[PDB]
Design a protein around this ligand. Structure first.
Ligand code: HEA
Ligand code: HEA
Ligand SMILES: CCCCCCCCCCCCCCCC(=O)OC[C@H](COP(=O)([O-])OCC[N+](C)(C)C)OC(=O)CCCCCCCCCCCCCCC
Ligand SMILES: CCCCCCCCCCCCCCCC(=O)OC[C@H](COP(=O)(O)OCCN)OC(=O)CCCCCCCCCCCCCCC
Ligand SMILES: CCCCCCCCCCCCCCCC(=O)OC[C@H](COP(=O)(O)OCCN)OC(=O)CCCCCCCCCCCCCCC
Ligand code: CUA
Ligand code: CUA
Ligand SMILES: [Cu+2]
Lengths: 40, 47, 236, 77, 534, 51, 215, 102, 55
C-alpha cells in the first residue's frame, strides 16, 4: 500500500532505468574511437 | 517625433524601394560580412 | 617526453614533483568527474520525467535546514580537496637541499641557456647558442619546430635550480615532462626547484608571446649518463 | 653535486630572487677591496653568488668596475 | 525622418541599433576566426604565406573585436534600456544626449581600430598589452594609439550607460515597489553596472598611462629605466575578471527571467540568492588575482589568493542547483528557450568544473599557460556569451517585433551550433593533457586530426551563421505567414491540464511584468501612467 | 553537414598543393630516428597521419 | 585641432542657447541636467585620482633593478620641483576666496556678483598668462633621457582641465551677454555652486603631495 | 516555511461564495491541484459542485481525470479507485468506457 | 480520505541527490580505475628501470 507501492520506483531507479543513462553517453565510444581508426 | 506605431518602422531601414527591396542593401551586408578579413589578407598577402 | 599524434595520456614524469602533482590532480579530477556525473544524472532524470509532467508545483521556496545542508556541503568538500592541495603547495614552494643551478636567459625569438655552475676547463663558464631550424634548413635528421641548433643537457639524479630571466620580452621556459614553466620577466629574476629522475629526451617550446619570431623559438633538452654529461660540460 | 651542496635554502627560500645578487656581492666586494690579504670571513658563501646568483650580472659588474663606470645605484665609499 | 536613427531620444531604437552593430561585429569576427582556423587547419602555408606578424594581427583582431564589439554593447544595452526603466513604470529614460554621444564616439573607435589593423606594422600582442610585449619597437606605427583611443571611448560609453542605468534604478523607482524583492534581472544589472563603474576607470587610467608612455617616451612600465609592468598587468587582471563577471551576470539574470516566465514556478531561494549575488558583487574585488600564481609572489600570498578563489566559487553551484529546482516539479516545454538554457547550464557546469580544476595553485605550476587554461576560458566565455545572446534573441524577438519566428529553423540552428561546439570542445581535454603549444602559426603536425575536426566545427558554426541571417530574412519576409499558420510558435508557454481553452485564451500569460502583454513597441511616449503594484 | 563537407572538399581542392616536404617517408624516418635510442617509452606510437 | 575645438565650443554654447530659449522647463529637465553634470564632474574627479595614483604608486619601491629605491640616485637630470608652485599657490588662494563666493552670488545676485565675476576673470587670465610664459623652453625638449619629467607631464595634462574651466566661464559670461541665462532654469549657477567644492578637495589632495613629496 | 494550507482552502470557499462564472472554478481548481496537498473527498466534492454550478460536463471530465492523474504519490491507485467510484456513483458520469478503448 | 498529507517534499530531493551521486561516482570510477591501474603498472615499470639504472 503506502509502503509497498513506495518502492516501485524508489529502489527501482538503480537497475531498471540505468540503461537509459548508459546509452545517453554511448555516442563517445562509437564516434571518437571510430574516427581514430578511420584516420589512423 | 511621436508618429511611430512600432510594427514595422522600428528597424533602421526603409522597406520601400524598387531598386532596394531589401535586396541590394542586404547583398551589400552579405559582401561586408566577409569583406574586412579578405581585404585585411589582401593588403599584406594573397587570398 | 615528445608530443605524439592522437595521444591519450600524459607524457612520462621526469621529476617527483611532476608525478605528485599529476596524481593529486588525478584525484581532484576524479572528484570532479563524479560530481559532473551527479549533475548529468540530475539533468537527465529531471528532463525525462518532466517532459510529460502532469502538475507544476509552485509553493516550495527555501527548505532552510536542507538548504543550509547543501550550502555547507560545498565548503567542506572544497576544504577536503584543498588539504592535500595545501600540503602539496607547502612542499613544492620550498626548496630542499638543492645541488646545482642552470640558467636560461633567451633573447628575442630564440633561446639562450647558461651552464655557469659547471666549469669548462678551469674557472671559465659554459655557454652555447641554440637557434630554430626553419623549413629551408629542415634536412634529413631534423624536426620542424622540435629541433634546435643545440640540445640542453641536464644532470640526471641531481637537484637543480632554474634561475630564469629574460632580456627584452618575457620568454616562457617550458618543459612539460619536468613539470616546470615560469614566465621570465626581463628585469626580474625567478628560480624554481626540481630534479630529473630518469634519462630521456624531452621537447619544449615558448608558451608566451615574443614577437614576429615567437613561434620558431623551441626548447630541445635531453638527458644522458652522468659520465657523458660531465664530459660534455668539460669539452663545451 | 650529489643532491647536497648548500643544504636547505636559508639565504632566500622564495622563488623570486630579484634583490638577491646585490646583497650577496656588496659584502664580498667590501671584504675583498679593503686590504687584499685575507678573505677568510667571506670564504663561506661562494655558491651564493656562484650558482644561486647568475654569473652574467657578476661579470657585468666586474667589467663595469674595470672600465671605471658603474650602472648600479651604489655609493663610491 | 533621420533624427529617429541618429538622435534617438527613445531607448528602443538605440537598443536595436546596438544589436545590429553587435551582430555585424560578431559575424565579421566569426568569418575571420573561420579564416584563422583554416590557417591552423593544417601546419604550413596553404592559404597564408606564413607571416607570423600577420597571424598575430588577426589573432588580436579576433580577440579584441569579439570581446569589445559583440558581447558588450547589445547584451547589456538592449536588455537594460528595454526592461530596467520600462518594467519599473517610468515614462521615459533620461540622458538621450549621453547615449547619442556614446554612439557617435563609437565610430571613432571602429575607424581607428580598422586603420590600426590595416597598417603594415599593426599591433599583434594579443589580448595582453603588457609592455615590453606591446612595445612600439616591434609593433610600430599608429596601431597602439588607435587601439588606446578605442579603448578609452568604449570605456566612456559603457561607464556612461552604467551611470544612466544606476540613476534610473535609484530615482525612477515606482512608489509601489519594495527594494528587497526586486527581480533577479534588476539586481543583476545593478551589480553589473556597479562592478563596471568600479572596474572600467582603473583600466582606463592604466591605458592612459600606457598612452603617455608611448607618446612622451617616458619610463613607467618598460624594463629599462626601473619600470614595473606588473602594475599594469594587475590592473588588466582587475579589469578582466570583473569584466568577465560583467559579461556573465546579465546572462544569469536573463536565464533566470526566462525560466521564471516559462516554468510557471518561482525560483528556489530567490531572495536568498539576491543576497548571494549582492555578496558576489561586493566580494568580486578579492578574487581578481588567481592568474598571477607564477609571477613571483610569496607562498602566503598564493595561499590567500587560492583560498579566496575557491571560497567564492560556491554560489555558482548554488545557482546551478537553484535553477535545477526551478525546473523541478514544474512543466518544461520542448521550446527553444528551454533547450538553450539547458545547454548553456550544462556546458557552464563543465566550464566551472575545469575552473575548479584550475583553482589549485600547486597544479597550476604544471598547468598554467598549457592548453588547459585557454580551453577553460574558451569554454566559459564562448558558451556563456554566445548561448546567452542566442537565448535572448530567440526569447525576445516576438517581444520587440511581434512577428513570429519559425520553430523548425530555430531547432535546426540550435542543433548546428550545439554539435559544432561539442565536436570542437570535446578533444580539448586530450589536447590539454598532451600540451599543444599555444599561439603558433605553424604548430607540430601531431594534432592534425584534432585541428581538422576543430575546423569542421568552425565551418559548421559559420554555416550556422549563414542560417542565422537567412532566418532573419525569412522572418522579415514571412512574419505575416508565421502569424497566419502554425509554422511558428504562437504562445510562449503551453497550458496545463487544469485550464479550459477559453480560459487559457483569455489568460495566455501570467508573468511578473506587463511587457509580454504590452503591445508592439508604442511611440516614444509610453508608460504615461505610473505602475502600481501590491 | 553535407554542405559543410562538400564546401570543405571544394575549397581544399581549390587550395592546391602547398607541401613539398613531410611525406609519409619523411615521417617514417623521423619516427625511426626518435624511437631508436634514448630510453624510448616502449618504442612510441607515432604513426604517419595520412597522405 | 583649433577649428575642432571652436566647433565643440560653438555646439556647447548653441545647445545651452536652445536650453535657455525653448523653455518648457520643469523640475525633471533641471534635475536631470544637474545630475548628469554632477556625474561628469565625478568622472573628472576619478580621472584626477587615477592620474595622481599613476605617479603616487612609487611609495614602497617594489622595483627590481636600476632604481627600486626612490629616488634612484645616480642620475642628475632637471628637477621638476619648484616650477609650478607659484601657479598652485595662486590657484589655492583663488579656491579659498571662491569656496563660498559662488554661494554668495546665488544668495545676492547683485553688484557683488559682478565684482566676483570680474575678479574671477582677472585671476584666470593671470593663471593662463603664467602658464603661457613657460610654453616651449620650460625645462628641456622631451625627446630622450627621462628621469624626472613625470611631474612636468602631470602638470601639463592637469592644466588642460583648467583651460576648459576658463573656457566654460567665458562661455557662461557670453551667455549672460546674450540674455539667456537668467534666474530661472539656471544651468551655469547650478553647476558653479558645487564646482568649487568638488574642485578644491581634489586639488588640495594633489597639492599636499606631488609638491611637498618626491623632491 | 511549512505554512498553513487550510487558509487557501477557506479562500477557495470564500471565492465560491463570490463565484460568478466557470473562470473562478478553473482558477480554484488550478490553485488547489498546484499544491502538494492531496484533496480530501470533502474538498473534492466542493470543487465538483463548484464546476457543476454552471453544469458543464466537460469540467466534470476534467476534474475526474485530474483526480485520476493528480500526483504520483508513490503510485496510489486503490484509494484513487474507490474515491473515483464514489464520486461517480454520487451523480453518475460514465466516460471511462469511451476514451480508454482507443 | 487520508487526512495527514504534505510529507513528500523532504525525501524526493534526498533520494534524487543520493542516486545522482552514486550513478556519477560509478560512471566516473569505471574509467578512472581503468586508466589509474594502467598508469600504476606503467609507473611500476618505470620505477623498475629507475632502480636498474643504479643497480
Ligand atoms: C569572448 C570570448 C571568446 C569567444 C566567444 C571566442 C570564441 C572562439 N574563439 Fe577565441 N579567444 C578568446 C576569446 C573568445 N574566443 C581570447 C581572449 C583569446 C586569446 C587572445 C589572444 O591571445 O590574442 C582567443 C583566442 C583564440 C585562438 C588563439 C589564436 C591563435 O593563436 O591562433 C583561437 C584559435 O583558433 C580561437 C578560436 C575561437 C573559436 C573557434 C571560437 C568560436 O566559439 C566562435 C563561435 C562564435 C559564434 C557562435 C559567434 C556567432 C556570431 C553571431 C552573428 C552572433 C549572433 C547573435 C545575435 C546578435 C542574436 N580563439
Ligand atoms: C564564465 C566565466 C568564468 C567562470 C565561471 C570561471 C570559473 C572559474 N575559474 Fe576561470 N577563467 C575565466 C573565466 C571564468 N572562470 C577566464 C577568462 C580565464 C582566463 C584568464 C587568464 O587566466 O588568462 C579563467 C582562468 C582561470 C584560471 C587561470 C589559470 C592559470 O593560473 O593560468 C584559474 C585558476 O585558478 C581559474 C579558476 C576558476 C575557478 C575556480 C572557477 C570556479 O568558480 C567555477 C565554479 C563552478 C563550480 C563550483 C563547479 C560546478 C559546481 C559544483 C560541482 C559545486 C560543488 C563543487 C565545489 C564547490 C568544489 N580560472
Ligand atoms: C581508403 C579511402 C577511402 C576514401 C577515399 C577518399 C579520397 C582520399 O583518401 O583523399 C584523396 C585526396 C585527399 O586530398 P587532401 O589531402 O584531403 O587535400 C589535398 C587537396 N589538394 C592539395 C590535392 C588540392 O582527395 C583529393 O585530392 C580531392 C579532394 C577530395 C575528393 C573530392 C570530393 C569527392 C569526389 C568523389
Ligand atoms: C536507429 C533507430 C532508432 C529508433 C528509435 C525510435 C524507435 C521507435 C520510436 C520510439 O520507440 O520512441 C520512444 C518514445 C516515443 O515517444 P513518441 O513517439 O510516442 O512521441 C512522444 C514524445 N514526443 O520516446 C521518444 O522517442 C522521445 C522522443 C522525444 C524526446 C527526444 C529526446 C529523448 C532522447 C532521444 C535520444 C537521445 C540520444 C539517446 C539517449 C539514450
Ligand atoms: C567528421 C569526421 C571527419 C574526419 C576527417 C579526417 C579523417 C578522414 C576520414 O575520416 O575519412 C573518411 C571519409 C572521408 O572522405 P573525405 O573525401 O572527406 O576525406 C577527405 C580527406 N582525404 O569518409 C567518407 O568518405 C564518408 C563519405 C563522404 C562522401 C564521399 C563520397 C564518395 C563518392
Ligand atoms: Cu620566447
Ligand atoms: Cu615565444
Ligand atoms: Cu577570479
Amino acid at each position: 500500500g503506502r509502503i509497498g507501492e513506495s518502492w516501485v520506483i524508489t529502489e527501482g531507479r538503480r537497475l531498471i532505468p540505468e540503461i537509459f543513462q548508459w546509452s545517453a553517453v554511448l555516442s563517445v565510444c562509437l564516434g571518437w574511437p571510430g574516427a581514430v581508426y578511420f584516420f589512423s | 517625433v511621436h508618429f511611430k506605431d512600432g510594427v514595422y518602422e522600428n528597424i533602421p531601414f526603409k522597406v520601400k524601394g524598387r531598386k532596394t527591396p531589401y535586396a541590394l542593401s542586404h547583398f551589400g551586408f552579405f559582401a561586408i560580412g566577409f569583406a574586412v578579413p579578405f581585404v585585411a589578407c589582401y593588403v599584406q598577402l594573397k587570398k | 617526453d615528445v608530443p605524439t599524434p592522437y595521444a591519450c595520456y600524459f607524457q612520462d614524469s621526469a621529476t617527483p614533483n611532476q608525478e605528485g602533482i599529476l596524481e593529486l590532480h588525478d584525484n581532484i579530477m576524479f572528484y570532479l568527474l563524479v560530481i559532473l556525473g551527479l549533475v548529468s544524472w540530475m539533468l537527465y532524470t529531471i528532463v525525462m520525467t518532466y517532459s510529460k509532467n502532469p502538475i507544476a508545483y509552485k509553493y516550495i521556496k527555501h527548505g532552510q535546514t536542507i538548504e543550509v545542508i547543501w550550502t555547507i556541503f560545498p565548503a567542506v568538500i572544497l576544504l577536503i580537496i584543498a588539504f592535500p592541495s595545501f600540503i602539496l603547495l607547502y612542499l613544492c614552494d620550498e626548496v630542499i637541499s638543492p645541488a646545482m643551478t642552470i640558467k636560461a636567459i633567451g633573447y628575442q625569438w630564440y633561446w639562450k641557456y647558461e651552464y655557469s655552475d659547471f666549469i669548462n676547463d678551469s674557472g671559465e663558464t659554459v655557454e652555447f647558442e641554440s637557434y630554430v631550424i626553419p623549413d629551408e634548413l629542415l634536412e634529413e635528421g631534423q624536426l620542424r619546430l622540435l629541433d634546435t641548433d643545440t640540445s640542453m643537457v641536464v644532470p640526471v639524479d641531481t637537484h637543480i635550480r632554474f634561475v630564469v630571466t629574460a632580456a627584452d620580452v618575457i620568454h616562457d621556459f617550458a618543459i612539460p615532462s619536468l613539470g616546470i614553466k615560469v614566465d621570465a620577466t626581463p628585469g626580474r629574476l625567478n628560480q624554481v626547484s626540481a630534479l630529473i629522475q630518469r634519462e630521456g629526451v624531452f621537447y619544449g617550446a615558448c608558451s608566451e608571446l615574443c614577437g614576429t619570431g615567437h613561434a620558431n623559438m623551441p626548447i630541445k633538452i635531453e638527458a644522458v649518463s652522468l659520465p657523458k654529461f660531465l664530459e660534455w660540460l668539460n669539452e663545451q | 653535486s650529489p643532491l647536497h651542496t648548500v643544504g636547505f635554502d636559508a639565504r632566500f627560500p622564495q622563488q623570486n630572487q630579484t634583490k638577491h645578487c646585490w646583497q650577496s656581492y656588496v659584502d664580498y666586494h667590501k671584504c675583498v677591496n679593503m686590504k687584499g690579504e685575507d678573505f677568510a670571513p667571506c670564504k663561506v658563501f661562494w655558491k651564493t653568488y656562484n650558482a644561486l646568483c647568475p654569473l652574467d650580472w657578476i661579470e657585468k659588474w666586474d667589467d663595469q668596475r674595470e672600465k671605471g663606470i658603474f650602472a648600479g645605484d651604489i655609493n663610491s665609499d | 525622418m533621420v533624427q529617429r536613427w541618429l538622435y534617438s531620444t527613445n531607448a528602443k531604437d538605440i537598443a536595436v541599433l546596438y544589436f545590429m552593430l553587435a551582430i555585424f561585429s560578431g559575424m565579421a569576427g566569426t568569418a575571420m576566426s573561420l579564416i584563422i582556423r583554416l590557417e591552423l587547419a593544417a601546419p604550413g602555408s596553404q592559404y597564408l604565406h606564413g607571416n607570423s606578424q600577420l597571424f598575430n594581427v588577426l589573432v588580436v583582431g579576433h580577440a579584441v573585436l569579439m570581446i569589445f564589439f559583440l558581447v558588450m554593447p547589445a547584451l547589456i544595452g538592449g536588455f537594460g534600456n528595454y526592461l530596467l526603466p520600462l518594467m519599473i513604470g517610468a515614462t521615459d529614460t533620461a540622458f538621450p544626449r549621453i547615449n547619442n554621444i556614446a554612439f557617435w564616439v563609437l565610430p571613432m573607435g571602429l575607424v581607428c581600430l580598422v586603420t590600426s589593423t590595416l597598417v603594415e606594422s599593426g599591433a599583434g600582442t594579443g589580448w595582453t598589452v603588457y609592455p615590453p610585449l606591446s612595445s612600439i619597437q616591434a609593433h610600430s606605427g599608429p596601431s597602439v594609439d588607435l587601439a588606446i583611443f578605442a579603448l578609452h571611448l568604449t570605456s566612456i560609453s559603457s561607464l556612461l550607460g552604467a551611470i544612466n542605468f544606476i540613476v534610473t534604478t535609484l530615482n525612477m523607482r515606482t512608489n509601489g515597489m519594495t527594494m528587497h524583492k526586486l527581480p533577479l534581472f534588476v539586481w543583476s544589472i545593478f551589480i553589473t553596472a556597479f562592478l563596471l563603474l568600479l572596474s572600467l576607470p582603473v583600466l582606463s587610467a592604466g591605458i592612459t598611462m600606457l598612452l603617455l608612455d608611448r607618446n612622451f617616451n617616458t619610463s613607467f612600465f618598460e624594463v629599462s629605466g626601473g619600470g614595473d609592468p606588473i602594475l599594469y598587468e594587475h590592473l588588466f587582471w582587475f579589469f578582466g575578471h570583473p569584466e568577465v563577471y560583467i559579461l556573465i551576470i546579465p546572462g544569469f539574470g536573463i536565464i533566470s527571467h526566462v525560466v521564471s516566465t516559462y516554468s510557471k514556478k518561482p525560483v528556489f531561494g530567490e531572495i536568498s540568492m539576491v543576497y548571494a549575488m549582492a555578496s558576489i558583487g561586493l566580494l568580486g574585488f578579492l578574487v581578481w588575482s588567481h592568474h598571477m600564481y607564477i609571477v613571483g609572489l610569496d607562498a602566503d600570498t598564493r595561499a590567500y589568493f587560492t583560498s579566496a578563489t575557491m571560497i567564492i566559487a560556491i554560489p555558482t553551484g548554488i545557482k546551478i542547483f537553484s535553477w535545477l529546482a526551478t525546473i523541478h516539479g514544474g512543466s518544461i516545454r520542448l521550446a527553444t528557450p528551454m533547450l538553450y538554457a539547458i545547454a548553456f547550464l550544462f556546458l557552464f557546469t563543465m566550464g566551472g568544473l575545469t575552473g575548479v580544476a584550475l583553482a589549485n595553485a600547486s597544479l597550476d605550476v604544471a598547468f598554467h599557460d598549457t592548453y588547459y587554461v585557454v580551453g577553460h576560458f574558451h569554454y566559459v566565455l564562448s558558451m556563456g556569451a554566445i548561448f546567452s545572446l542566442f537565448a535572448g534573441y530567440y526569447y525576445w524577438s516576438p517581444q520587440i517585433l511581434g512577428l513570429n519566428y519559425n520553430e523548425k529553423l530555430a531547432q535546426i540552428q540550435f542543433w548546428l551550433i550545439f554539435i559544432g561546439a561539442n565536436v570542437i570542445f570535446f578533444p580539448m581535454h586530450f589536447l590539454g593533457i598532451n600540451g599543444m603549444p599555444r599561439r603558433i602559426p605553424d604548430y607540430p603536425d601531431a594534432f592534425a586530426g584534432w585541428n581538422y575536426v576543430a575546423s569542421i566545427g568552425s565551418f559548421i558554426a559559420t554555416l550556422s551563421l549563414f542560417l542565422f541571417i537567412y532566418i532573419l530574412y525569412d522572418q522579415l519576409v514571412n512574419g505575416l505567414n508565421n502569424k497566419v499558420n502554425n509554422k511558428s510558435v504562437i504562445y510562449n508557454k503551453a497550458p496545463d491540464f487544469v485550464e479550459s481553452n477559453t480560459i487559457f485564451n483569455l489568460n495566455t500569460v501570467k508573468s511578473s511584468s506587463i511587457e509580454f502583454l504590452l503591445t508592439s513597441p508604442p511611440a516614444v511616449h509610453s508608460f504615461n501612467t505610473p505602475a502600481v503594484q501590491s | 553537414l553535407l554542405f559543410s563537407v562538400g564546401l570543405f572538399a571544394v575549397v581544399r581542392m581549390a587550395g592546391g598543393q602547398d607541401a613539398k616536404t613531410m611525406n609519409k617517408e619523411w615521417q617514417l624516418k623521423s619516427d625511426e630516428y626518435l624511437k631508436s635510442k634514448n630510453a624510448n617509452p616502449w618504442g612510441g606510437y607515432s604513426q604517419v597521419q595520412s597522405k | 585641432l583649433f577649428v575642432l575645438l571652436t566647433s565643440s565650443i560653438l555646439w556647447f554654447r548653441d545647445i545651452v542657447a536652445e536650453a535657455t530659449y525653448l523653455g518648457d522647463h520643469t523640475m525633471a529637465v533641471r534635475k536631470g541636467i544637474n545630475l548628469g553634470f554632477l556625474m561628469f564632474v565625478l568622472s573628472e574627479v576619478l580621472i584626477f585620482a587615477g592620474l595622481f595614483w599613476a605617479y603616487f604608486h612609487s611609495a614602497m619601491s617594489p622595483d627590481v633593478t636600476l632604481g627600486a629605491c626612490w629616488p634612484p640616485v645616480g642620475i642628475e637630470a632637471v628637477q621638476p620641483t619648484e616650477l609650478p608652485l607659484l601657479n598652485t599657490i595662486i590657484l589655492l588662494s583663488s579656491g579659498a576666496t571662491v569656496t563660498y563666493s559662488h554661494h554668495a552670488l546665488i544668495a545676492g545676485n547683485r553688484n557683488k556678483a559682478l565684482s566676483g565675476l570680474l575678479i574671477t576673470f582677472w585671476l584666470i587670465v593671470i593663471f593662463v598668462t603664467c602658464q603661457y610664459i613657460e610654453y616651449t623652453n620650460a625645462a628641456f625638449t622631451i625627446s630622450d633621457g627621462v628621469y624626472g619629467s613625470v611631474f612636468y607631464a602631470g602638470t601639463g595634462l592637469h592644466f588642460l582641465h583648467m583651460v576648459m574651466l576658463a573656457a566654460m566661464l567665458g562661455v557662461n559670461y557670453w551667455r549672460m551677454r546674450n540674455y539667456h541665462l537668467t534666474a530661472g532654469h539656471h544651468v551655469g549657477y547650478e553647476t558653479t555652486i558645487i564646482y568649487t567644492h568638488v574642485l578644491d578637495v581634489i586639488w588640495l589632495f594633489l597639492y599636499v603631495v606631488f609638491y611637498w613629496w618626491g623632491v | 516555511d511549512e505554512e498553513t494550507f487550510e487558509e487557501f482552502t477557506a479562500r477557495y470557499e470564500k471565492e465560491f461564495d463570490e463565484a460568478y462564472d466557470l473562470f473562478e472554478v478553473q482558477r480554484v481548481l488550478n490553485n488547489c491541484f498546484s499544491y502538494d496537498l492531496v484533496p480530501a473527498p470533502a474538498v473534492i466534492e466542493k470543487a465538483l459542485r463548484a464546476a457543476r454550478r454552471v453544469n458543464d460536463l466537460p469540467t466534470a471530465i476534467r476534474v475526474f481525470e485530474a483526480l485520476k492523474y493528480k500526483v504520483e504519490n508513490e503510485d496510489q491507485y486503490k484509494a484513487y479507485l474507490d474515491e473515483l467510484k464514489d464520486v461517480r456513483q454520487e451523480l453518475g458520469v460514465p466516460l471511462k468506457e469511451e476514451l480508454f478503448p482507443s | 480520505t487520508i487526512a495527514p498529507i504534505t510529507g513528500t517534499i523532504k525525501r524526493r530531493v534526498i533520494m534524487d541527490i543520493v542516486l545522482g551521486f552514486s550513478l556519477g561516482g560509478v560512471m566516473a570510477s569505471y574509467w578512472w580505475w581503468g586508466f589509474h591501474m594502467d598508469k600504476i603498472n606503467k609507473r611500476e615499470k618505470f620505477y623498475a628501470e629507475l632502480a636498474e639504472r643504479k643497480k
